[model samples]
Structures are given as structure tokens and as C-alpha cells.
Target: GSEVSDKRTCVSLTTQRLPCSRIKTYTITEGSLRAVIFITKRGLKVCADPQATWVRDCVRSMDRKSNTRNNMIQ
Candidate 1:
């Protein structure tokens, strides 16, 4: 019944009685939001430019995508 309660909080629903997929982020800058989706699904397929520091380092790590995702949640 409650779509949103306190504004700053996020609510996720998963249970035997009820299952639902909810948006964790309601809003973002268009570029930032697009980047998030792009990075998650396309992380490996995308080449890391050695000249670029972050991407290059990320690709070198064993679990780049997973580490990136975990950091994003925090």
C-alpha cells in the first residue's frame, strides 16, 4: 500500500508471500544513470584504455564488476 514512506529511505520487497522488483534509485542525472547501467552489463565487453586510470585498474582486478557493484551499493 505504501509506495514511499520516509523520503530518504529505500524499501526493497522479497518474500514467500510477496515478491516484487523495485527501483533502488528513483532519480539520477541522465549521464550518471546511463553510466551505471552501461558499466554493470557492459563492463567486460568494454575495453579498458590503459591511458585511462580507473578503467584500466578495474580491468586488471580479478572481480572488477563485482567490486564495482559492491562499492556502488555502499
Candidate 2:
């Protein structure tokens, strides 16, 4: 969770019946999501998605840092 800082990740998955058994996080290092949205604030930059539980969960996991940062600021 430390954004790939350490040598090895100390996290483990312990789910019984995993909806999304694996996760792959991509890097958006140059700018933040807010910055991109800010630049496009005049017009809505929609993020379309599927309604399946696993897809939602996958999206949440991949964007955990964004959500956590927003949560911490509040």
C-alpha cells in the first residue's frame, strides 16, 4: 500500500470466495485525478462502469489511494 516503496509487500489476501481474486494497480504518476478533473471541470468527464459487484470492487481496490486521500482530507 506504500505505493511500491518497500522491497516486498506485507499484505495478504485471505478471502474465501473472492469476487476478484487478483489485483493489478496502474501508475498515474505525472498528475492526480483531481487535477485532470479540474482541467475538465467545464464539461463532465464521465467514468462509465459496469454494475457487477466484482467490477466495482476491482475499481475501488485499484483506486484505493485516491479514495483514502479524499477520506483523510475530510
TM-score of each: 0.22, 0.27
Summarize candidate 1's per-residue lDDT along 1-74 as a digit string, tens digits. 23333332222211111111121222211321122111233221121223334433333342444556564432
Name the lDDT value of residue 28 in candidate 1: 15
Q: Name model 2 segments beyond 4 Å from true.
A: 1-21, 26-49, 68-74
Residue 50 error for model 1, in Å? 1.7
In candidate 1, stretches whose alpha carbon ends up further than 4 angstroms from where it belongs are 1-44, 63-74
Distance (Å) between predicted and true CA of 58, model 1?
0.5
Q: Which ten residues in a row have the lowest lDDT in candidate 2?
A: 31-40
Question: Please, what is the whole-model Cα lDDT of each candidate in the order they appear?
Answer: 0.26, 0.32
Clashes per model (N, Cα, C within 3 A) = 0, 0
Residue-wise C-alpha lDDT for candidate 2, range 1-74, written one tens digit per residue: 33344322222222222333333332221322211011012232222222335545654655675765543221
Candidate 2 displacement at residue 5 in angstroms: 29
lDDT at residue 40 of model 2 (Cα atoms): 16
